[PDB]
Design a protein around this ligand. Structure first.
Ligand SMILES: [Zn+2]
Length: 604
């Protein structure tokens, strides 16, 4: 017994030409080239590596399939030679050993595949697919904004020590696992040092010690709101926006211009004991008890503009291929599909408001993460969003501005009319960061502007990545590099504060020059006036790389160890591997610098 195919649906042609083929892309999920009538699916997100699935209407698993990609200007981007149906990526339930029958599962039969680089996924992209003498064109590809998510993590102890159970924050792989489920180009997970509050001061001017006089719970308690949410979370969000002061009561003062969320763990001593907070999110905040699984995907989901049971059954239940709201996930690092069903054969149906989705070969179909869904396996510790929710999440990111160090305003926002990221003016009067994603010391507390009395500065909060600038609530970001009716001596920041970047690597700064791994996105940066050691670090040597040079900088590369034999190539701006292969060197010849061995960063 062998081969159990998920998608047995009749392929519909998506091309204009000789070749009849169905086309699918795959980022945070498998998405169609042409969505069916009444189906809600996300479209391609700009600047994110995409799988390309080609299913010829008239099957041919033998004749080589090729893809020629062209940009808006009709310049050939590249040519790919697809993998035969036999080489189609497996499920994450597959095991290595040739004769636990999940290994039989395969997405579909007769599907050809390739990987389209991130820099191709930009509005204007057109494909020409050829299968021998046959050819077809896909020239109406919808590509959305390169969406961004900035997520802060802090563990708050309120009249107690921090819980120390923020699994997500302590696990880099979880940041990566979550990135696979959402339709963004870039995700930054910023670590804040845990906050310990032995005393708690309220905007009413009431100092607490020992316990909050009211009751607390999962969704309640005064501290949970005033401190956990407004002071800490909206404090971190507001400081990054440059707002020096806001009211000590309320959430409306938060501008929420960028998709910036401050996720926390909060527990405090109340008049009914130590109460752990959780189960909520919105307006740039996340109150998490469980930081992995459904609670994370739901709470964060709320920040994307989502409610509960989005669009009833049609929108909330994961479906088989003959239906709408049907898809499978994609793990772009593992190079494997994430099926929308549990690995166990329980023969259970998935129902909502009486409607049901029948199981796939015994496997129970999942659930949106705003309708009580849960991860399928430890392969991805997060809940898969249904195509309907994923489409809403995508629209949400596209409509948000982005912190952008290369922008004249420090911000960029998508122009749906010109199909490009354009500068966005942030208003406090114009407000622009002096420093971008630098370590930060977030100073926080309350002050009485009229006086008489009770102004209180809280202990300094320390972040790995933030933005710096030149009763009421104060929230100011100071660069940690500086070293730090009330006065308080500020403790220096602890050591190991680190942020994570998933997807698109961060851009090179003004007087900086990088080479970046096409695979991992891990950068090797040097400032202007600096060179590498004798040879580049072992990790980057032999790797497929792109150059990212700052406005005031120039990148010098050699294909030899030490910038030797005058075999130096000059790279300015953003240069891709294909444009690193025939570059004129200082020694008057054209050389390949696609696998460099030494580097130097100069001005100009
Ligand atoms: Zn909810």
């Amino acid at each position: 017994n062998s081969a159990i195919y998920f998608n047995t649906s009749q392929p519909i042609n998506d091309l204009q030409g000789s070749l009849a083929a169905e086309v699918k892309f795959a980022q945070s999920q498998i998405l169609p080239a042409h969505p069916k009538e009444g189906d809600s699916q996300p479209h391609l997100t700009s600047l994110r590596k995409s799988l390309l699935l080609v299913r010829p209407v008239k099957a041919d698993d033998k004749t080589p399939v090729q893809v020629e990609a062209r940009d808006d200007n009709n310049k050939i981007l590249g040519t790919l030679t697809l993998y035969p149906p036999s080489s189609l990526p497996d499920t994450i339930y597959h095991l290595d050993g040739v004769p636990l029958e999940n290994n039989r599962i395969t997405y579909a039969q007769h599907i050809w595949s390739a990987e389209l680089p991130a820099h191709w996924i930009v509005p204007g992209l057109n494909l020409v697919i050829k299968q021998g003498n046959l050819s077809g064109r896909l020239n109406d590809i919808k590509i959305g904004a390169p969406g961004e998510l900035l997520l802060h993590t802090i563990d708050i102890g309120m009249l107690t020590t921090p819980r120390d159970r923020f699994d997500f924050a302590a696990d880099a792989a979880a940041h990566r696992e979550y990135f696979q489920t959402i339709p963004v180009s870039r995700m930054i997970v910023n670590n804040y040092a845990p906050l310990h509050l032995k005393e708690v001061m309220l905007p009413t001017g009431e100092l607490l010690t020992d316990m909050d006089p009211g009751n607390g719970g999962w969704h309640s308690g005064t501290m949970r709101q005033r401190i956990g949410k407004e002071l800490v979370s909206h404090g971190i969000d507001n400081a990054n926006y440059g707002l020096n002061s806001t009211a000590g009561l309320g959430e409306n003062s938060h501008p929420y211009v960028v998709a910036q969320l401050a996720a926390h763990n909060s527990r405090g001593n109340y008049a009914n004991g130590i109460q752990v907070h959780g189960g909520s999110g919105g307006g740039g905040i996340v109150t998490l008890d469980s930081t992995l699984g459904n609670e994370f995907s739901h709470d964060v989901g709320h920040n994307y503009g989502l409610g509960h049971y989005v669009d009833g059954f049609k929108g909330s239940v994961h479906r088989s291929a003959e239906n709408n709201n049907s898809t499978w996930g994609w793990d772009g690092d593992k190079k494997r599909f994430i099926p929308n069903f549990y690995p166990s054969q329980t023969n259970e149906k998935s129902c909502l408001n009486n409607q049901c989705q029948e199981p796939f070969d015994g496997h129970k179909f999942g659930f949106d993460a705003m309708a009580g869904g849960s991860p399928f396996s430890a392969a991805n510790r997060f809940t898969m969003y249904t195509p309907n929710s994923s489409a809403i999440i995508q629209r949400f990111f596209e409509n948000k501005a982005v912190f952008d160090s290369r922008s004249s305003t420090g911000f960029s926002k998508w122009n749906a009319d010109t199909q490009e990221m354009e500068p966005y003016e942030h208003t406090i009067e114009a407000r622009k960061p002096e420093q971008f994603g630098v370590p930060v010391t977030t100073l926080v507390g309350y002050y009485d502007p009229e006086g008489t009395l009770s102004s209180y500065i809280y202990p300094a909060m320390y972040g790995a990545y933030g933005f710096t600038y030149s009763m009421n609530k104060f929230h100011i970001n100071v660069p940690t590099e500086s070293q730090p009716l009330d006065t308080k001596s500020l403790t220096p920041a602890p050591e190991g504060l680190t942020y994570t970047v998933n997807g698109q690597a961060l851009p090179a700064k003004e007087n900086e020059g990088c080479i970046v791994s096409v695979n991992s996105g891990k950068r090797y940066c040097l400032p202007v006036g600096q060179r590498s050691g004798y040879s580049l670090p072992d990790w980057i040597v032999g790797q497929e790389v792109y150059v990212d040079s700052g406005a005031k900088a120039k990148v010098l590369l050699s294909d030899w160890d030490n910038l030797s034999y005058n075999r130096i190539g000059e790279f300015v701006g953003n240069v891709n591997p294909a444009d690193m292969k025939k570059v004129k060197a200082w020694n008057g010849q054209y050389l390949d610098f696609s696998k460099p061995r030494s580097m130097r960063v100069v001005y100009k």
